[PDB]
Design a protein around this ligand. Structure first.
Ligand SMILES: NC(=O)c1ccc[n+]([C@@H]2O[C@H](COP(=O)([O-])OP(=O)(O)OC[C@H]3O[C@@H](n4cnc5c(N)ncnc54)[C@H](OP(=O)(O)O)[C@@H]3O)[C@@H](O)[C@H]2O)c1
Ligand SMILES: NC(=O)c1ccc[n+]([C@@H]2O[C@H](COP(=O)([O-])OP(=O)(O)OC[C@H]3O[C@@H](n4cnc5c(N)ncnc54)[C@H](OP(=O)(O)O)[C@@H]3O)[C@@H](O)[C@H]2O)c1
Lengths: 639, 639
């Protein structure tokens, strides 16, 4: 009896659905579940790879002695998990093949946009959330009614170390969309376990780095390490150019338009020697020539067309005026822009740092991780947890949820005199009133710009703040679903902000999170409502942070939802879900912002104490602690 | 092929040592490791139970088809893990039987003292640390040199949910010694993994509540639930008596001596009707008669001899003067003091609450936990982690390591005027100087009592604080290893404290935590040095907290070790070990203190930011943040 005999019978009688099941970790989970007696459905996009994994597993089952192997491994091609229609067709296909699903393995996880937040299109961020997070809720919502009806089920989200930990965030620079989606997979397990129990287990796994094609690549496409290496070099050029232009603009009278025109020759030596160029650009050109590889055209040309478009988008998004065609006639540098020597050097440094982080100084294989996971899936007695099948890393984490604090120093508070404050929100009218009055009346801010969602919320705040509106100290802008343009309007008409307090427009929903055993679940939080929760409680803050991180001098506070004595226990859960998931965003953009030209601070203030009222005195002291917390992170630090 | 065939070969070639291996979870781990091919040594105290487990396992191995089963299961009787001499004999016995140990399963875990901190003898606390925590380091220190020499090994500490989580404490009222030992088992794994890798894995497991004799009991001895139930009733009587006497003393001119004499008739109805008794004691007697079971003598008698001795010890330890024989002639109430109906009612409430905490509303068996653990032990790719083989609980956790804070309000600071401050410490002379001067010069405290360890430390602080010593504002007491008597001296001579800041006497050691592969490890932190670390960095704070929790009006800050730019990476690790382990103490005594008559606040201030210097300005701002942090938790809250 060989190694697969430790598996025989382990999951006999189980039906498992594995997304991303045609390769990688999910391929090996589907393989090993099938060897252990489960009937499996493998879902992914490319038909050919699914058929090759299906034939490999079926062949292996027969070697072990199973009969009718065609009934034990099924495939669902064309299934992009980011498409809800496909997820509905997946469930229909799986139930018709096998009946009720016991194990939902939410394994598919796209790498995402792989850009800094400030270069990350809003739609790409949405696509990552749909593929990696919203799909996990969508499949659970479709399969959990059947699991609960039969009395048993298991939902397993494949998260990551870069989704953080129960009480600590871990930044993942250039991967904020991925990190947030990973963190949300874990938070789903932590907050939904109490509702899904006793019948249904829900846990996450969070592997450390895994040896396979995703990290290492193949003979055709570069893996995560090589892509990260080239991006290190690309973004080094973009960040250095962007930073130098911002600095040069600080002490040159020419416009950003005219400074960018100095780059049009795209000639490194000609810019170093151009006596009419500001010295920040000439020292940059000297730097490119000194540190660069003489065989790379990046060492003799400033830009390529792709980096030029990223630069222009940053300048446009940070309020500068330049024609869209400014880079149309830019000479194209001859290939290669960075050589293989540069890229491979950076790739080896990426892998060597990661191996140095691991306590064990070795990565598991995809087979190793799947094996640990398939043993873990036999444990009937744990729910709400994150299992680490590999790992142990020296990465720096940021503890979340510190409870005690006071006011900032008198020195930092005096710097608020004369400042411009942006407040963003709609639902939390009492917080918004109190904050505006604290900035204007207590700390001598010049003005507050109150950015709301609707005209009705505008009128609510104008009424609450009627005296400051009349004195011209409180301005209201109606953002709708165009918050970027509203921030542009504030900047143009009232000036750049110091403090920016970003509260959600919308409250949390008040619907059930699970259905009664014999119900149709029709009142339970729907798939589209979960996408809406993400839009209003995550994407909202991301969009504001994306713009405000280009606004020099701003200090940004991201405020997560409130829960009161009125709030249902489902609202408490969803607030804790959002807290944990957003902390992954906040920690990540914090690290990226240190590398940006712009001095901007980004912090998170949580209104829900995760504790779950006694007289309006305790109410007014809970709100006063909120004011203190916001001031603690929006008062500037005197240089 | 049956269920044990999923185990055949899983740990073939491994030698495992399981402490507490004759029953419970450790018995099942030893059983299941032996079925999976490992040779096992089972260690525990009682010879008979070890022989019965050995014969059961050997018999089962033979049923499965192993030969020479006598070579596969060995026992080590007489091994109390709290005795270092026994641990040395255990290792010698195991190496001679099997050669090198691959798996150290630190499973033995005594329940401990099972009292509130204020009723917990210092020696019992020490015994729990020796049995449950110091023994884990001791066996690792003896076995890790051989594991590292052969290139592989595994250390598994059996911790608990009530050891908390990486970044959050979980209180365990009446079990502070056990909770601290559990938390230290986890912290050992988290901080030692980077040093023990790549050759040696070290993780913890933390089961939730487990179905077996430990929780449920047997037909002879009561299990954890029944003991907890009786203790609920006993301690309810003790706490209520203690509280009423303290209150009665607040408004009666008689001494505590004379008030306690009112209890000597031990007659509930006679005290309710005694017109000479203070009303707090008469309302207590009325309460005992109203809520009590008429069949329990607790409803007609005030005390028994055991509760009387606990009461007297609390009064003596809180500074009151009473003769040791005051309860010598106390009439003994006839059995039963609490009936079976009362105790069983409380036991059912204990079990029902626990089952309601579990998301899954069911406990694993000892077999289930061992099975999950034995699968986990095959995972070669994770170190430094805590695996939860069962669990998912609704318990409230306290996040640790919040980073941002300011000063407390002006209102709380003004209440420091005229206060008496106790500072405890020796090594941290700069912190102690700065704190004393902040209390005396900035906030108008009446006086500081500086409690040091040695005459040399006394003279150091007298020199640093020479002006305040001359003005009579700074008093020094030399505690030696008698910190309780030193606190008694402060109280008698200078008055009760408001703020009490407890810093460690000793710095952290500067020795290696692991040895080079071919070394003898003789310079590595020794077994006795690890016990010393616990004495100086845990037991120190516990002893102070034990006394100060009886001092009305005190606010206690427990300060964990400092790490600077000088500090080695081993010191950084040991500081993080102590931080995590002490937070379990701080969170637990905080909950017990809410139930004590005495209004005392207990908080923890961590000097090591777990981050790992730029000019004395950053130094003076790091120390100023320490001052702010200490003030934030020692300034009283105005009523
Ligand atoms: N690799 C690591 O080091 C690591 C570490 C921690 C966590 N994880 C997590 O582990 C999970 C699996 O990772 P992996 O390394 O196995 O990734 P991978 O190798 O890139 O996954 C490949 C599989 O995912 C499928 N897939 C890709 N995009 C998809 C989409 N939009 N819809 C449906 N299926 C899709 C692929 O098939 P098609 O392309 O044909 O659709 C293929 O079946 C992920 O959730 C990842 O976040 C990985
Ligand atoms: N039970 C739970 O719900 C639970 C939950 C979480 C964690 N845990 C942890 O799991 C571990 C095992 O727990 P358990 O429920 O199996 O405990 P248990 O049933 O009380 O353990 C009994 C075993 O421990 C031995 N033992 C007791 N005191 C000892 C000492 N001073 N030295 C050496 N051996 C000793 C006993 O033999 P002798 O009496 O003959 O020495 C017997 O072999 C413990 O570390 C515990 O903290 C338990």
């Amino acid at each position: 009896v060989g190694w697969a005999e430790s598996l025989i019978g382990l999951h006999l009688g189980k039906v498992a659905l594995i997304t991303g099941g045609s390769a990688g970790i999910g391929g090996q989970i589907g393989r090993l579940l099938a060897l252990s007696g489960a009937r499996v459905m493998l879902a992914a996009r490319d038909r050919h790879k699914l058929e090759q994994m299906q034939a490999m597993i079926q062949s292996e089952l027969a070697e072990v002695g199973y009969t009718d192997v065609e009934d034990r491994v099924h495939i669902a091609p064309g299934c992009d998990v980011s498409s809800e229609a496909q997820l509905a067709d997946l469930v229909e296909r799986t139930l018709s093949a096998f009946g009720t699903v016991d194990y939902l393995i939410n394994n598919a996880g796209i790498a995402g946009v792989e850009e800094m937040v400030i270069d990350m299109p809003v739609e790409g961020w949405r696509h990552t959330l749909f593929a990696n997070l919203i799909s996990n809720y969508s499949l659970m919502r479709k399969l959990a009614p059947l699991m609960k009806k039969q009395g048993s089920g298991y939902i397993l989200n494949v998260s990551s170390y870069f989704g953080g930990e129960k009480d600590a965030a871990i930044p993942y620079p250039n991967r904020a969309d991925y990190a947030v989606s990973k963190a949300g997979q874990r938070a789903m397990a932590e907050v939904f376990a109490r509702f899904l129990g006793p019948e249904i287990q829900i846990n996450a796994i969070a592997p450390g780095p895994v040896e396979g094609d995703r990290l290492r690549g193949t003979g055709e496409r570069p893996g995560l390490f090589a892509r990260r290496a080239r991006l290190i070099l690309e973004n080094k050029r973009l960040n250095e150019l962007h930073a130098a232009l911002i600095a040069a603009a600080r002490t040159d009278e020419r416009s950003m338009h005219e400074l960018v025109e100095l780059l049009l020759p795209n000639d490194v030596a000609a810019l170093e020697q151009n006596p009419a160029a500001p010295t920040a650009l000439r020292e940059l050109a000297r730097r490119f020539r000194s540190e660069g590889d003489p065989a790379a055209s990046s060492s003799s040309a400033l830009l390529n067309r792709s980096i030029a478009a990223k630069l222009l988008a940053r300048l446009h998004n940070g309020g500068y005026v330049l024609p869209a065609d400014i880079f149309a006639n830019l000479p194209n540098p001859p290939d290669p822009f960075f050589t293989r020597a540069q890229i491979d050097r950076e790739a080896r440094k990426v892998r060597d740092g990661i191996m140095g982080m691991l306590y064990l100084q070795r990565m598991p294989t995809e087979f190793d991780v799947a094996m640990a996971t398939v043993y873990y899936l036999a444990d009937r007695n744990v729910s709400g947890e994150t299992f680490h099948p590999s790992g142990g890393l020296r990465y720096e984490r940021t503890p979340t949820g510190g409870e005690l604090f006071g006011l900032p120093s008198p020195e930092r508070l005096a710097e608020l005199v004369g400042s411009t404050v942006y407040l963003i929100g709609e639902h939390l009218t009492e917080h918004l009133n109190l904050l505006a009055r604290a900035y204007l009346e207590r700390y001598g801010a010049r003005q507050v710009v109150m950015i709301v969602e609707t005209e009705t919320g505008a009128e609510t705040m104008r009424r609450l703040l009627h005296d400051h509106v009349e004195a011209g100290r409180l301005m209201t802008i109606v953002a709708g679903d165009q918050i970027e343009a509203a921030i542009d309007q504030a900047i143009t008409r009232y000036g750049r902000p110091g403090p920016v307090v970003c509260t959600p427009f919308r409250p949390l929903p008040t619907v059930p999170l699970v259905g009664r055993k014999d119900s149709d679940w029709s009142t339970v939080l729907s798939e589209a409502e979960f996408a809406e929760l993400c839009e209003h409680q995550l994407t909202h803050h991301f969009r504001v942070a994306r713009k405000i991180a280009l606004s020099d001098g701003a200090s940004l506070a991201l405020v997560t939802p409130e829960t009161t004595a009125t709030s249902t226990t489902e609202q408490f859960a969803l607030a804790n879900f959002i807290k944990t998931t957003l902390h992954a965003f906040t920690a990540t953009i914090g690290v990226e912002s240190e590398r940006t030209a712009q001095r901007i601070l980004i912090n998170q203030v949580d209104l829900t104490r995760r504790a779950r009222p006694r007289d309006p005195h305790e109410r007014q002291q809970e709100l006063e602690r909120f004011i203190e917390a916001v001031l603690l992170v929006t008062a500037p630090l005197p240089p």
